[PDB]
Each structure stands twice: as C-alpha cells, then as structure tokens.
C-alpha cells in the first residue's frame, strides 16, 4: 500500500477530489435519474478550475444549481489548497530553506 510521499501529493489530492465529487453527485441526484452523466460534471469541474486559474468568469448557461453550487464549492476548496501551498513555499523560498528547483518554478508560476 504505497505512501503519498512527495511526488504523489498533487496526484493524490486530485485523485481524492474527484472521488468526493463522485460521492456527492451520486447522493445529490434524485430517485429517477438514469445514473449516467458523472463524467460530464467532472469535466465541468475541471473546466471551472481552469477558468478560476485563468481569472475567467465561469458560467454555464443551462446547468442545475445544485451541480453549479457544488462545483463552486469544490473549486473554492482547490483554490484554498493551491493558495496556501503557494504561501508556504514562498515563505520557504524566502527564508532559504531546502526547496526543490521545480517548486521554485511552480511557485513563481503561481505567484
């Protein structure tokens, strides 16, 4: 049972975020839904995250408000994780602590 060490961290976070969204949309759909359409909502969530990072205002013209609110909720959660990781690595790069070179490039790109 492999450990999430240092190079699995973002892939494990984005692995678990998808699972939480899957459980929420399986609980959120009412009783007579065809139980398809999970992949499309996951793509809407990935596109909403890209539009958050690009500072593009994200609005789908027809979309149910529980799905739209849930996507906004999880996009705010990934925003918080992204931003707090950026603050932490910037304080580390400022003090001179042991940092990777890739985390310096990633941190510049986030800042």
């Amino acid at each position: 049972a492999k450990t999430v060490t240092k190079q699995r961290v973002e892939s494990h976070f984005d692995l678990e975020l998808r699972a939480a969204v899957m459980h929420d949309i399986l609980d959120m759909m009412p009783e007579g839904i065809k139980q398809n359409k999970a992949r499309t909502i996951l793509q809407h969530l990935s596109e909403a995250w890209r539009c958050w990072k690009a500072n593009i205002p994200w609005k789908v013209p027809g979309l149910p408000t529980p799905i739209e609110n849930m996507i906004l909720r999880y996009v705010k959660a990934k925003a918080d994780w992204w931003t707090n990781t950026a603050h932490y690595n910037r304080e580390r790069i400022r003090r001179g602590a042991t940092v990777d070179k890739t985390v310096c490039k990633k941190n510049l790109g986030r800042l």
Binding site: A1, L15, R18, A19, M22, A38, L42, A79, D80, T83, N84, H87, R90, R94, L111
Partner: protein
C-alpha cells in the same frame, strides 16, 4: 486511453496481511520491527475513567466559562503647504481584527502580495 481517470478504487483484502497473512511471508519492513511495545494508560491525576465517572461536568464547565468571561471582561514654519492634515480621525481602522473566508480578499493575502511583489 493511457491518460485516464479512475472511476473505481483498488479494493483491499488481497495483499500482505489480508486473509492468510498473504500465506505467511518472510519479508518485513524496518517500520514493522518492535517499537512502542507498551501501552501507556491514564494515571489517577491525568483523566482515568474512575475519576471521570463521578464528576459533574456541567458545574465545572459553567465555572470555567464564567472565569473565561470574567478574564475577557477584566482585560477589556511652512504653514503654506497646499495639503492640510489628510488623516484627521483615522484611528488605524481595525482591518487586523477582521477575518475573511476568501483567499484572494483576505488580510493575510493582501499583506502577502504587498510584501512579495515589487
């Protein structure tokens, strides 16, 4: 294709300790050596369940609540210059008391972006 999501996890019950100890292997990690082989228990002064059982928690909780509220209560030449005093009554305008649930409009983030970009 190659790049694909999951849509189902890997199930447990088929490796190293799951049903027959994976048929009794002779392989063991360095994290699986004996370590902390003695459970520490709560002593009589700490919070042992003999002492927790007879205690009335509501009276002590109300007393500590009262003491905390009481502590918080007892704690609390060139006159010709073209611009006059611009800050008259600005008594520091307590932004540092506010806490905002927004990582872009927080006070810590505004201090961050003020510090780290010139």
């Amino acid at each position: 294709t190659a790049a694909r999501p999951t849509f189902e996890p890997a199930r447990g019950g088929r490796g190293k300790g799951e049903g027959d100890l994976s048929q009794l292997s002779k392989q063991y990690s360095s994290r699986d050596l004996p370590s902390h082989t003695k459970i520490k228990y709560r002593q009589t002064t700490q919070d042992a369940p003999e002492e927790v059982r007879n205690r009335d928690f509501r009276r002590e909780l109300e007393e500590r609540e009262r003491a905390a509220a009481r502590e918080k209560n007892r704690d609390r030449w060139d006159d010709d210059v073209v611009f006059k005093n611009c800050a008259k009554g600005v008594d520091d305008q307590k932004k540092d008391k506010r806490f905002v649930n927004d990582t872009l409009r927080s006070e810590f983030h505004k201090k961050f972006m003020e510090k780290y970009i010139k």
